[PDB]
Enzyme design. Structure first.
Site, PDB file in Angstrom:
ATOM      1  N   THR A 160       0.836  -1.197   0.000  1.00 53.45           N
ATOM      2  CA  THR A 160       0.000   0.000   0.000  1.00 53.45           C
ATOM      3  C   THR A 160       0.874   1.252   0.000  1.00 53.45           C
ATOM      4  O   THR A 160       2.071   1.189   0.303  1.00 53.45           O
ATOM      5  CB  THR A 160      -0.951  -0.006   1.193  1.00 53.45           C
ATOM      6  OG1 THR A 160      -0.194  -0.203   2.396  1.00 53.45           O
ATOM      7  CG2 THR A 160      -1.860  -1.235   1.132  1.00 53.45           C
ATOM      8  N   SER A 161       0.281   2.385  -0.350  1.00 50.41           N
ATOM      9  CA  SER A 161       1.055   3.607  -0.492  1.00 50.41           C
ATOM     10  C   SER A 161       1.306   4.281   0.866  1.00 50.41           C
ATOM     11  O   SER A 161       0.432   4.315   1.738  1.00 50.41           O
ATOM     12  CB  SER A 161       0.459   4.542  -1.572  1.00 50.41           C
ATOM     13  OG  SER A 161      -0.648   5.258  -1.102  1.00 50.41           O
TER      14      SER A 161
ATOM     15  N   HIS B 192       8.667   0.888   3.100  1.00 53.17           N
ATOM     16  CA  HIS B 192       8.312  -0.401   3.695  1.00 53.17           C
ATOM     17  C   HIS B 192       9.608  -1.185   3.905  1.00 53.17           C
ATOM     18  O   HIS B 192      10.583  -0.954   3.206  1.00 53.17           O
ATOM     19  CB  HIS B 192       7.405  -1.227   2.762  1.00 53.17           C
ATOM     20  CG  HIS B 192       6.016  -0.690   2.599  1.00 53.17           C
ATOM     21  ND1 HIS B 192       5.244  -0.265   3.659  1.00 53.17           N
ATOM     22  CD2 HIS B 192       5.249  -0.525   1.492  1.00 53.17           C
ATOM     23  CE1 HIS B 192       4.068   0.144   3.214  1.00 53.17           C
ATOM     24  NE2 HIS B 192       4.045  -0.003   1.902  1.00 53.17           N
ATOM     25  N   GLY B 193       9.624  -2.114   4.853  1.00 51.39           N
ATOM     26  CA  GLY B 193      10.779  -2.979   5.024  1.00 51.39           C
ATOM     27  C   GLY B 193      10.496  -4.261   5.784  1.00 51.39           C
ATOM     28  O   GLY B 193       9.389  -4.526   6.253  1.00 51.39           O
TER      29      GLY B 193
ATOM     30  N   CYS C  64       9.726  -0.673   8.573  1.00 46.62           N
ATOM     31  CA  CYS C  64       9.527  -1.920   9.301  1.00 46.62           C
ATOM     32  C   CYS C  64      10.767  -2.809   9.314  1.00 46.62           C
ATOM     33  O   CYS C  64      11.536  -2.853   8.369  1.00 46.62           O
ATOM     34  CB  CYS C  64       8.397  -2.696   8.644  1.00 46.62           C
ATOM     35  SG  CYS C  64       7.036  -1.740   8.419  1.00 46.62           S
TER      36      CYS C  64
END
Lengths: 233, 232
Positions: free
Chosen positions: B29-30, B88-89, B130
């Site tokens: 997701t953005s 993100h991660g 993350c």
């Protein structure tokens, strides 16, 4: 200025030094020569800082746990902090007991802010001298339950950790030296930074095998501490 | 020689990889409100006299390729080097728009032996992303790997909280704390103030218990061998 942890509780806190030298025929792991020097260096150093030192030798993966389980259940109300040193073979995220591997997380969780209420909000220090892999460095010319923990690793993630049979491990050798020299002045991060430069610059490996020769090492400070840490008031 | 030499003709570059929109083929997701951090960061490192370079919505190939170039530049007149990642991660990886990248893959570029002009100079990597999905319930000759520092937004294993309007807990706090202390304290101590600030001022809010009242502690990973002062 609540900028730094309160260190004048009646006791500084206990120092648990787990010193693993000899490993079962089952492991096919070598004997960790030099360690007994480190254990001695730590004991003297930490007594001078006023910690209640306890030296436990050659413990089993089970014994590691059980020891860690008790200490956690003790009442650390009168204590400023907690310190624990693990000295043995390793891999990323794991230290070896005499019989087998223990996951570092399993022995640190006993002390999470919600499992050891008497240590909540005080520094939990874990000094780890052990391998975090095999990579060799060639050199070049309400609060969070995970908070108040600091991990002082002897090597970068993924790497070998060098030990010397006469002087003990590069890392524990330098740490003691550095505390001995600065515990009464500098904040702990700054001492550990000094430790880094010492290990990084003053040490280099020696072998007849060109693979294992001229190898370098950097320690790895991992801090989720919330305050500055001074060993004096 | 106690602290880094920070008196070169230039502080150095500050690349900032800010990923907001992801590919349809990713499920990802953005990342709403990430521009708020990207801005807040840019303004801040500029005040530290860094040559700031913004990049938005890079693919994994773009990221690898940008780092390779930047690492191939000549850093001789530069004091340090800063790279900020906003995405993100998962443990050890951050996401490109099209997919994943091993963090080690991007940092290896700067290892003392590969970016020769950055040997002896601080390399900082600030990582808002993350490192897993656990939530914190809370309670009431030198080494080629030397001179590196990673300022992660969270402990290993854990999620990383953001606020779409105000910015991430961590970046919001880094900028606030660097603004206010970059000229008194050493970096390690600023970062220790960031830990206290994220750790005591921020608490998650949800109508669902699962995501309610969650805490976060960032995580400083230092391989530096000297103290670091944004002043002299």
């Amino acid at each position: 200025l609540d900028n730094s942890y309160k260190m004048d509780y009646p006791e500084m806190g206990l120092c648990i030094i787990i010193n693993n030298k000899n490993f079962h025929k089952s492991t096919g792991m070598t004997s960790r020569s030099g360690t007994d020097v480190d254990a001695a260096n730590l004991r003297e150093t930490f007594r001078n800082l006023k910690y209640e030192v306890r030296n436990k030798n050659d413990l089993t993966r089970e014994e590691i746990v059980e020891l860690m389980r008790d200490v956690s259940k003790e009442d650390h109300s009168k204590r400023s902090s907690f310190v624990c040193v693990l000295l043995s073979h390793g891999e990323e995220g794991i230290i070896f007991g005499t019989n087998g591997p223990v996951d570092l997380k399993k022995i640190t969780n006993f002390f999470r802010g919600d499992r050891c209420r008497s240590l909540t909000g005080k520094p939990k220090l874990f000094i780890i001298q052990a391998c975090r892999g095999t990579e060799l460095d060639c050199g070049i010319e309400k609060i969070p339950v995970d908070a108040d923990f600091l991990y002082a690793y002897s090597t970068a993630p993924g790497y070998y950790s060098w030990r010397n049979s006469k002087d003990g491990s590069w890392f524990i050798q330098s740490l003691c030296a550095m505390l001995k020299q600065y515990a009464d002045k500098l904040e702990f991060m700054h001492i550990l930074t000094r430790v880094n430069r010492k290990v990084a610059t003053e040490f280099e490996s020696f072998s007849f095998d060109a693979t294992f020769h001229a190898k370098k090492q950097i320690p790895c400070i991992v801090s989720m501490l919330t305050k500055e840490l001074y060993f004096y008031h």
